[PDB]
Design a protein that fits this description.
Radius of gyration: 23 Å
Number of helices: 1
Family: Belongs to the type I cytokine receptor family. Type 2 subfamily.
Order of helices and strands: EEHEEEEEEEEEEEEEEEEE
Organism: Homo sapiens (Human)
Protein name: Leptin receptor
Shape: elongated
Subunit structure: Present as a mixture of monomers and dimers. The phosphorylated receptor binds a number of SH2 domain-containing proteins such as JAK2, STAT3, PTPN11, and SOCS3. Interaction with SOCS3 inhibits JAK/STAT signaling and MAPK cascade.
Disulfide bonds: 15-27, 26-36, 68-79, 123-133, 125-130
Largest sheet: 11 strands, mixed
Helix content: under 10%
């Protein structure tokens, strides 16, 4: 048990009050419902909060938007923890104790993950408090659900996140497409194609923003093709063809890849 689905992939989180020993539980923020879960790693996570602790918490409030996707190579699972508020004068310095467990699927009855089964991997944080991590994931047990509950001790203030349940194979955000080239074919059609990442196991469909614009008269004609190669028909001379391609997994949920550098072909 202790599984909570998350929608969409990016979830907004903020910390609520339940000093160094005290751990403060942080919950997801949504306009409809609020979900709070306690990580099985530490039962003692819920601690008594003093009046001075509450005053400190209301004086300085830390809220973090967390978006995490697995690499296309499946070797490491990145996990970005970005704060809503960034202050130049004061920057929080902390060590993030990320704990992850991905146990095998049990055929009969649901089993809550055991205490201590979570693996320990430290995180790397930038000056904008955007903490990116590298979480290894075994390939055999990759197909099973992954449970997340982060521990962030920020200057004597410990942060805890609710348990998320999501399949990591649909959590992959692919690398932006590269190697795209343009050349008019002998058939009479512009050839623009891209190579799928070999490390990505699942088939990838692509969101293409192709625009047929002319300098004299500006018109927009967007076309999206799921195939690896795009053969746009009825090419007109003396027009600009700005094309940019991003890809994501076809079946089931998927995270769109970041848009690459736009490239435009201007015909004579």
């Amino acid at each position: 048990n202790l599984s909570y689905p998350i929608t969409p992939w990016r979830f907004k989180l903020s910390c609520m009050p339940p000093l160094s020993k005290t751990t403060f539980h942080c919950c997801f923020r949504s306009e409809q419902d609020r979900n709070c879960s306690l990580c099985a790693d530490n039962i003692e996570g819920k601690t008594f909060v003093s009046t001075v602790n509450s005053l400190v918490f209301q004086q300085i409030d830390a809220n973090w938007n967390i978006q995490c996707w697995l690499k296309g190579d499946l070797k490491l699972f990145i996990c970005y923890v970005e704060s809503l508020f960034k202050n130049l004068f004061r920057n929080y310095n902390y060590k993030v104790h990320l704990l992850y467990v991905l146990p095998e699927v049990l055929e009969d009855s649901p089993l809550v993950p055991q205490k201590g089964s979570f693996q320990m991997v430290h995180c790397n944080c930038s000056v904008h408090e955007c903490c990116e991590c590298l979480v290894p994931v075994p390939t055999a047990k990759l197909n099973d659900t992954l449970l997340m509950c982060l521990k962030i001790t920020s200057g004597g203030v410990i942060f805890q996140s609710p348990l998320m349940s999501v399949q990591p194979i649909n959590m992959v955000k692919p690398d932006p497409p590269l190697g795209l080239h343009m050349e008019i074919t002998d058939d009479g059609n512009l050839k623009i194609s891209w190579s799928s990442p070999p490390l990505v196991p699942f088939p990838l469909q692509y969101q293409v923003k192709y625009s047929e614009n002319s300098t004299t008269v500006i018109r927009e004609a967007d076309k999206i093709v799921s195939a690896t190669s795009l053969l746009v028909d009825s090419i007109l001379p003396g027009s600009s063809y700005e094309v940019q391609v991003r890809g994501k997994r076809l079946d089931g949920p998927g995270i769109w890849s970041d848009w690459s550098t736009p490239r435009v072909f201007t015909t004579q």
